[PDB]
Amino acid sequence: NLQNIIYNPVIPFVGTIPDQLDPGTLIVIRGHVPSDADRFQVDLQNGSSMKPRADVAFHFNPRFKRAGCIVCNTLINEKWGREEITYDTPFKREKSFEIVIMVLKDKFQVAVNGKHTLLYGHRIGPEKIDTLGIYGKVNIHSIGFSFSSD
Amino acid sequence: NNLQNIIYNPVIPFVGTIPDQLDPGTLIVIRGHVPSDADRFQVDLQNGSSMKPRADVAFHFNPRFKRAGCIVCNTLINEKWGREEITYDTPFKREKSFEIVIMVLKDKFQVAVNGKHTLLYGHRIGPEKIDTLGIYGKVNIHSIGFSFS
Ligand SMILES: Cn1c(CO[C@@H]2C=CO[C@H](CO)[C@@H]2O)nc2ccc(C(=O)O)cc21
Ligand SMILES: Cn1c(CO[C@@H]2C=CO[C@H](CO)[C@@H]2O)nc2ccc(C(=O)O)cc21
Ligand SMILES: [Cl-]
């Protein structure tokens, strides 16, 4: 059921999500972490405004310093909320990944390389998300959606 | 037969509390038969048993018998049905007995009937929200039991 919006996008990438992230929707991101990566992020946004900065419903932010982690958060009116940090991180410098974001009624559920990674409760209604951004030190092979509505 | 909370010949419609959480690896095992004039029946994995307003249905598993038959899978959220996922390759048949095995995985349900893979259904509601098993419609249920993880 997977409809790729794009292959091998230049980073930073910002794209319109062509249908609503209804419960059951999957977002599938395939890529590779360069050997000098500090961090990258996948942001599910309410628009693409840079000034002022678009709200980020879901900021999914792998960080590579020390033993590494994933920081998840929400940006509302240009302010970050309570960080949810996952120390059990599957990402590594110079390794390839497949991220699967499952949109559920009340949360995102993220798996990497087929292994459960984390959950993130909705702080912004996911119906307000219409943009996907990927930023930072990361190589993206593909971004695709499997929409509920299809 | 190591199954847990096994009950026999429940009255239909059935609405029962699921006696533990639907963690990855959990099985729900339902044995029954389709009466000869069945239009449809359903197995609903619900978030409670509210009738008004109607309880969310994480997984509606709805065999239908008209024409070549099918299984309709859907989710009810805030009394609105989502996009139907229809399986046209259906193992169910009027006057035939069945064993349904619903395996809960982290990202989907995997359903087998009489030991044959039938369908997959991706989660739309977190399965931790499911506490109720409803069985409704034109069906006889011989037994229900569980395998918890
Ligand atoms: C660093 N950075 C940010 C801000 O990220 C925040 C910094 C710290 O904590 C926040 C989460 O709590 C968030 O990661 N937003 C960004 C967007 C793009 C880029 C970039 O490299 O192109 C870099 C970016
Ligand atoms: C017919 N029906 C429903 C509604 O089913 C919906 C109707 C059409 O499409 C939906 C799936 O998209 C769903 O089967 N909920 C029910 C609950 C119980 C019964 C009953 O026969 O007891 C019958 C019921
Ligand atoms: Cl949920």
Residue numbers in the entry:
A (entry chain A): 7 to 156
B (entry chain B): 6 to 154
Question: What do the study's own words say?
Answer:
Galectin-8N was first cocrystallized with lactose, and then the ligands were soaked into galectin-8N-lactose crystals, followed by collection of X-ray diffraction data at 1.52 and 2.1 Å resolution for the galectin-8N–6a complex and galectin-8N–9 complex, respectively. Both complexes showed that the O4 and O6 of the d-galactal portion bind to galectin-8N in a similar manner as the corresponding oxygens in the d-galactosides. Namely, the O4 of the d-galactal is involved in a hydrogen-bonding network with Arg45, Arg69, and His65. Further, the O6 of the d-galactal engages in hydrogen bonding interactions with Asn79 and Glu89, while the O3 engages in a hydrogen bonding interaction with Arg45. As for the galectin-8N–6a complex, the five-membered ring of the benzimidazole ring is placed in a favorable position to engage in cation−π stacking with Arg45 while the basic nitrogen of the benzimidazole engages in a dipole–dipole interaction with Gln 47 and Arg59. The carboxylate moiety of the benzimidazole establishes a water-mediated hydrogen bond with Gly142. The endocyclic double bond of the d-galactal moiety in both complexes is placed in proximity to the guanidinium side chains of Arg45 and Arg69. A NH LUMO of Arg45 overlapped with the HOMOs of O4 and the d-galactal double bond. Hence, a favorable interaction between one of the Arg45 protons and the d-galactal double bond likely contributes to improved affinity of galectin-8N for d-galactal derivatives. Compound 6a is the most selective galectin-8N ligand to date with 15-fold selectivity over galectin-3.
pmcGalectins are a family of proteins that bind β-d-galactopyranoside-containing glycoconjugates through their canonical carbohydrate recognition domains (CRDs). Galectin-8 is a divalent galectin found in the liver, the kidney, the cardiac muscle, the lung, and the brain. Galectin-8 is a carbohydrate-binding protein that plays a crucial role in tumor progression and metastasis, antibacterial autophagy, modulation of the immune system, and bone remodeling. However, there are major differences between the two CRDs, such as the presence of Arg45, Arg59, Tyr141, and Gln47 in the N-terminal CRD (galectin-8N) and the presence of Ser255, Asn257, and Asn348 in the C-terminal CRD (galectin-8C).
